[PDB]
Design an enzyme around this catalytic site. Structure first.
Site, PDB file in Angstrom:
ATOM      1  N   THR A 235       0.964  -1.131   0.021  1.00  0.00           N
ATOM      2  CA  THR A 235       0.006   0.052  -0.027  1.00  0.00           C
ATOM      3  C   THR A 235       0.884   1.101   0.090  1.00  0.00           C
ATOM      4  O   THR A 235       1.514   1.501   1.181  1.00  0.00           O
ATOM      5  CB  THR A 235      -1.109   0.097   0.981  1.00  0.00           C
ATOM      6  N   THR A 236       0.894   1.775  -1.268  1.00  0.00           N
ATOM      7  CA  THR A 236       2.056   2.844  -1.421  1.00  0.00           C
ATOM      8  C   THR A 236       1.486   3.241  -2.786  1.00  0.00           C
ATOM      9  O   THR A 236       0.608   2.924  -3.790  1.00  0.00           O
ATOM     10  CB  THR A 236       3.450   2.207  -1.649  1.00  0.00           C
TER      11      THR A 236
ATOM     12  N   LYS B 146      -8.750   1.472  -6.960  1.00  0.00           N
ATOM     13  CA  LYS B 146      -7.878   2.352  -5.944  1.00  0.00           C
ATOM     14  C   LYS B 146      -7.378   3.409  -6.989  1.00  0.00           C
ATOM     15  O   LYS B 146      -6.450   4.162  -6.155  1.00  0.00           O
ATOM     16  CB  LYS B 146      -6.918   1.525  -5.284  1.00  0.00           C
TER      17      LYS B 146
ATOM     18  N   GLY C 212       3.521   6.001   1.670  1.00  0.00           N
ATOM     19  CA  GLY C 212       2.968   4.929   2.068  1.00  0.00           C
ATOM     20  C   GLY C 212       3.911   4.084   2.496  1.00  0.00           C
ATOM     21  O   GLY C 212       4.989   4.412   3.218  1.00  0.00           O
ATOM     22  N   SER C 213       3.736   2.543   2.569  1.00  0.00           N
ATOM     23  CA  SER C 213       4.408   1.668   3.175  1.00  0.00           C
ATOM     24  C   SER C 213       5.974   1.575   2.461  1.00  0.00           C
ATOM     25  O   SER C 213       6.864   1.312   3.078  1.00  0.00           O
ATOM     26  CB  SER C 213       3.853   0.138   3.310  1.00  0.00           C
TER      27      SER C 213
END
Lengths: 202, 242, 48, 242, 202, 242, 242, 242, 202
Positions: E1-2, E33, E130-131
């Protein structure tokens, strides 16, 4: 994070670090932590990125309204007390940010330091703000002369944050300086400021 | 008696609502303000002759800052102007808060048109008895007029108040949007003299302007306005011989 | 309209002329306008 | 008198509401608007004639994008329109929030009608004295006229405002349901010419449409307008020689 | 999730991960998304799936309506502030998504980051969120000239999101690359994006 | 008139709101009050006159301190005046809460003009039938009159009340702008002397003032009054023989 | 005068509000109440006159207790008085809650009068048509008239009610500042005996007083009112030979 | 006079709230309810004659319970009696709730007067058109008359309704305070007898009484009523022979 | 963090230590922690700078309002009770603090200790309060005389707090003494004090 303020006899010089670092997290390449409230007035914040940005937008807009209302720009004092009050109102949302609100007015130059429980206090001297503050005071106070300009303040404000970076894993780069020399409201940006610290290293 | 105007909610048999048309008259009996738009920016000029010598000269105010790049001036009850102009600066500023953009001339004009219309529709509170001039440069110079009801009209040039009618006749023939900043300033000053049937004095007018090439608000200073007044005075005097 | 005309003509006698004019008329109308529901007055104070 | 008529909450002995009956007539006092529907879209024509030349040639605007695939015309007072279109737009964009789909030209026009019906029951407020023509393509073209009573009538071609009476008569004989887009469009401009009794200039009328090969709002600028206006002006001349 | 975002000379190009997997649950393998807000504006989400779409649907609705009322296209700065205000005002209905609003508008090109706690900061021309954010900054800055084309930008955008998913073990395999060249709004989408990165052998 | 003067929600055909014109007559029911502005401080003279000799003269004042450099006088109802200045006390204080700064005289006038203005707009409430003269010093001396409607007029020399008429007449002729505080103090007592039509005694007037080097309100006690009143009493006699 | 007395939010053209003028006629209609302020105290005597023996000896009540050092007494609408005084009681207590200081009469009168003023303002509520005379010793003795319009007046000696006119005349001669506590109270009985025009017994007058030298309210027994009645009666008798 | 008796807001020149006093004529038309007090307690007797022998004449009724030592009879609308008496019941137990002591006759009387006055003083809501007589022994016998107005008058023995005129004249002559429980009970029956001009029977009357000696409300059954009825009856006829 | 207070016979004296620290930011070290409530009325706070100053503005403003409205200077008790009731309202979040409100009034001189969650109690001539209270009773009482002057009270106020300082661990260097003899409202401030205490510690 850490933001420094010092009152010169020729203006107000404060400085910020744009990167906001959690501990190992580059969050932002760049970020505004410096909000231009007026061509004489500033808010330079240390704290959370997201909540600080929300609140700065409030004050900036109502700073201008209060300028229009009287036909006569704020006092440095009047915005600061507005931030203490707006923080205590909104303490039922959990916003923690420490601010330096500073600038130039008809009374002279002053900085008011704000904690996220409230309070605004007068300082004519050295003030530093954040978790790099304890270090910052050590640098700033000694080399504070009341003969200090905004010309010698920019080297000093750089140097305070700079030391701080080398003992904190939460202090970012993107060292910014704002200078309010009572002729302009100037943002040096990263580039220029980075050569100033190139003469404090090699 | 009539009873089509014992309330604004009572419509006339004539297909009209007279109570809001009396609210037009309310403006008229108040003193003039003229907005002059050229393609080099827009100018806003308003009366400060009103009142004797007991008074202070600085008669606060016809020429209101709203934004630092939007000005408004008024005619009508300046009771009914004063709360609406505070409301106008709050509402304007709310656009500024919530998008971080300067309010556009048009959109401001519409919002103040809408705010009057709450008072027009409702009967718990009367319609305002004030008219408004909104002048600015968003990036395109615009000039609007707000009616007491809250109607929206785009103008090349407009007047309201007592001088509404002299200014209308003058500009119908001569005015052009392709005029200069210099011409536009002096030319509405000529038109302003006729309306008060006197010779201008710079202490008798407060003048602000919005420049296209600054894109900022400045209020004109008495003695900086002074050449614009001298050059106008040749025409004002001449045109009242006849 | 006839009474406005006669009144105008009387107004001229008062200015010692027989020349009837728009200014003579203006005073003459006003006599009639005074009677009926009068739009004149007031400027503020508060309506300015 | 006559009435029974100084309230909206009072039924008159004629079985009407006087207040409302008078408010349909306030629409007629303001300008015309001409709607025409064809099997190739729905064109909407709205009178942009106002003032002399002191006003801007373009006066806002008078033909609003309500949704992307819906537009509405206004007739009657500018003030009442200003606020009426605000709620219609919000309610349309709310339909896309709650269903994620087009809003029907019919169902939208009903909810416009509901807003003025609320102000017809409560005695503390007046309804708007303004009528919009509701033209769009839901997925097929549809034309409706909204009334200040809250009334809804599906038309095929219509006028409302000043030209109401005149342009109904014109369309009895002339209107044909197999007209091309260009033919219908041109026929609507003849109907405006009849209304004003003068040759149309394309600079003082505003035209917008939604087609059914596009299904999105477009607007015909005055440069684009010329041939259409010329094709109208031949017949308008023919009317104004009889 | 980035999510990543870069500003071209000729457009703006941004990228998403398109398959979002948490634990062993996969919502869909065509779970959206990637959001189209306007004609030459896009919005790219990092963070939760469910809060991403529900928030986005309301912002399309604002976009349209603001265009109609002002009669001018809304700015990237306007909606970036708008989203922030919404997030701070709804903390009793909190949304847990980190936005990136970017595109072409009248002002020019710019890309704003919006925090899940609200507040809108601007990055000059590169941003990663994000991550995956820490690696993703270095992938972009290797080739980044401000004179990169759209054709190379969409190439660059893939290598950052592709690196991020394989390093983590609970991320899925899907990527969307979006190009907004100021004349075209192309959505390349998983198949086409996949073969762009199939030239690496693995 | 004819029911166009018996409500607050009606304009007349004149565009005049008569209810408000009547609220100004309320001001004129009340007694003489005068303010003078000079460039060295601001001067306030209130009538302290008692109805009978059995009414105590201690609380029958018009002069109320509102801030540390702001005082004010009133004419109108006592009833309306007392609540109306208490609101202005809260405003002035609150300004000091949120800015820690004593309110500007100009800023205070604007807020309480807008306070009154909602009481004027709403139909379920009257406007306050009061005018104030707000006298203070913030950087430099300022002097204002608030209208019962909510209009704001800046003045340099003014009165309200029954004595209003006579006092303007006096200050037309006599008044000068280069008079000091001491000298102008004398002139304001001759003006008050004019209006009540007698040689004053300290026990029927109350004087308060704000000078610039004090930056505070101070109040002129009857001891401190006498020498000014004697100088004035001399000239007051001469006008009771004219 | 009609149409300016039909509402409390309508001013007559004199600037008088006849609604409020008619509320002094309420006061004059009801029982007399005389208050005497002295250097040694403040004595308040209110009519306890009964017109039949069917009425109980004590009719509740002519002298209310507000605080243990503050009393007030009534003339007007005795119905109205009940709500008015319940509130009066509550404010004096409330101030001891939040500042823990006994309320002073000046401020208590202000607060009660503000509570009146609120119902003069609003169109939905008619104002108190009852007057109370509030008396107390704080730092020095005080006597106030709180009026149905919401005006406070401090007096040296006063009266209200039907006996109002006689006693304004009486104390004009007789109130002197050489009066003792006993010679002041005899005087309140004599003043009272001229109003009703008959001799007294203790039970047609109700006296309480507040003495300085206790700083406390006492309510005077019939037994020790008998002696003072006798001294008054002599005076009354001579006054009734005129 | 008129035109000041059709609204509850308006004052007359007289100062009399005539709307409140027509709510007292609503009381006056129907029907005798009598209170008579002694030192042995208080006795409450009320009529129960209304229509033919098809109306069950043992119930419906005036003699409502308010407490275990407080009882009231009514005169005026039956509708107002139901709610007002519920409020008085609720307030008796609120004293028990919050002080857990027997409600005093005085306190109760003051509350329920204040309650009626609130609806009197608030415009737009009428005054209750009913009257009570409040009878009770706290530790001391009290008999009060509580008015539609919201006013409080204490008596030794009184009556409201139709009989009010008759029974006052009667009690002027007849009443001494040296009566017993039984001598008061019978003397009230004789009062009530002349007011309807007839011989009373247990069927058409109702009596509740509150004794000092027990301080119970007791409700007197017709059996118990009857010995007293024979005793009052010889008097009632004799005075209808006079 | 400790505060003391004593009525002399002819004045009222209170003193306050300036050291407030939160995190690595020192809030007050030379910035006031003493506020002017009226002309000869003061308030000292033991507690945090944010809380203290927001409360103090409230009480200051209503203090001004008291002098105007009723045309009577406020008494020690007016302010005191008022502060309590207000402290009762807000209890939802930290607003618990140890306050001393004193000065001169027309009934004489007073000092009142206001308890955190409401309440106002009075103290004849010695108060403390603070965490150093135990130490303060020894110093203050032993050297109290009821015919104590101003001179030796400003001297005594320094001695109680500074001997207490050592035993306390959130107290430290920097001290303010305030004097209200009904002729001055003086704030001695750190610098002047460090020189008087140069005699009673060395």
């Amino acid at each position: 994070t850490t933001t420094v303020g010092l009152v010169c006899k020729d203006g107000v010089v404060m400085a910020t670090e744009k990167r906001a670092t959690m501990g190992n997290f580059i969050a932002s390449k760049a970020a505004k932590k410096i909000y231009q409230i007026a061509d004489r007035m500033a808010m330079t914040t240390a704290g959370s990125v997201g909540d600080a940005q929300f609140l700065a937008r409030i004050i900036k807009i109502e700073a201008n309204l209060y300028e229009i209302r009287r036909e006569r720009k704020p006092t440095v004092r009047a915005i600061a007390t507005l931030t203490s009050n707006l923080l205590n109102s909104y303490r039922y949302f959990p916003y923690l940010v420490q601010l330096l609100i500073g600038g130039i007015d008809s009374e002279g130059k002053s900085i008011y330091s704000i904690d996220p429980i409230g309070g605004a206090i007068e300082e004519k001297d050295i003030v530093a703000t954040g978790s790099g503050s304890l270090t910052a005071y050590g640098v700033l106070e000694d080399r504070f002369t009341p003969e200090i300009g905004v010309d010698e303040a920019v080297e000093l404000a750089v140097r305070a944050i700079y030391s701080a970076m080398k003992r904190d894993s939460a202090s970012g780069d993107g060292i910014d300086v704002v200078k309010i020399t009572e002729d302009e409201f100037y943002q040096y940006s990263p580039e220029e400021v980075e050569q100033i610290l190139a003469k404090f290293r090699k | 008696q009539m009873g089509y105007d014992r309330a604004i909610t009572v419509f006339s048999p004539d297909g009209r609502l007279f109570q809001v048309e009396y609210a037009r008259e309310a403006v008229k009996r108040g003193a003039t303000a003229i907005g002059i738009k050229c393609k080099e920016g827009v100018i806003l000029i308003a009366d400060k002759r009103v009142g004797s010598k007991l008074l202070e000269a600085d008669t606060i105010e016809k020429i209101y800052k709203i934004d630092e790049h939007i000005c408004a001036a008024t005619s009508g009850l300046v009771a009914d102007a004063r709360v609406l102009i505070d409301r106008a600066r709050i509402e304007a500023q709310i656009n500024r808060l919530t998008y971080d953009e300067p309010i556009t001339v048009k959109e401001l004009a519409k919002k103040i048109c809408d705010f009057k219309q709450q008072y027009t529709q409702y009967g718990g509170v009367r319609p305002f008895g004030v008219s408004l001039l909104i002048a600015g440069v968003d990036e395109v110079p615009k000039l609007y007029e707000t009616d007491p009801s809250g109607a929206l009209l785009e103008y090349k040039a407009t007047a309201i108040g007592m001088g509404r009618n002299a200014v209308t006749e003058f500009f119908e023939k001569e005015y052009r949007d392709d005029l200069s900043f210099d011409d536009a300033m002096v030319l509405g000053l000529v038109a302003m003299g006729l309306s008060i049937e006197s010779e201008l004095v710079p202490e008798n007018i407060e003048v602000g302007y919005v420049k296209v090439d600054d894109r900022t608000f400045k209020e004109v200073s008495p003695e900086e306005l002074k050449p614009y007044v001298e050059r106008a005075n040749e025409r004002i005097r001449e045109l009242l011989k006849k | 309209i006839k009474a406005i005309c006669t009144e105008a003509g009387m107004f001229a006698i008062r200015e010692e002329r027989a020349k009837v004019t728009m200014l003579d008329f203006t005073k003459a109308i006003e006599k009639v306008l005074k009677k009926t529901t009068p739009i004149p007055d007031l400027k503020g104070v508060m309506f300015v």
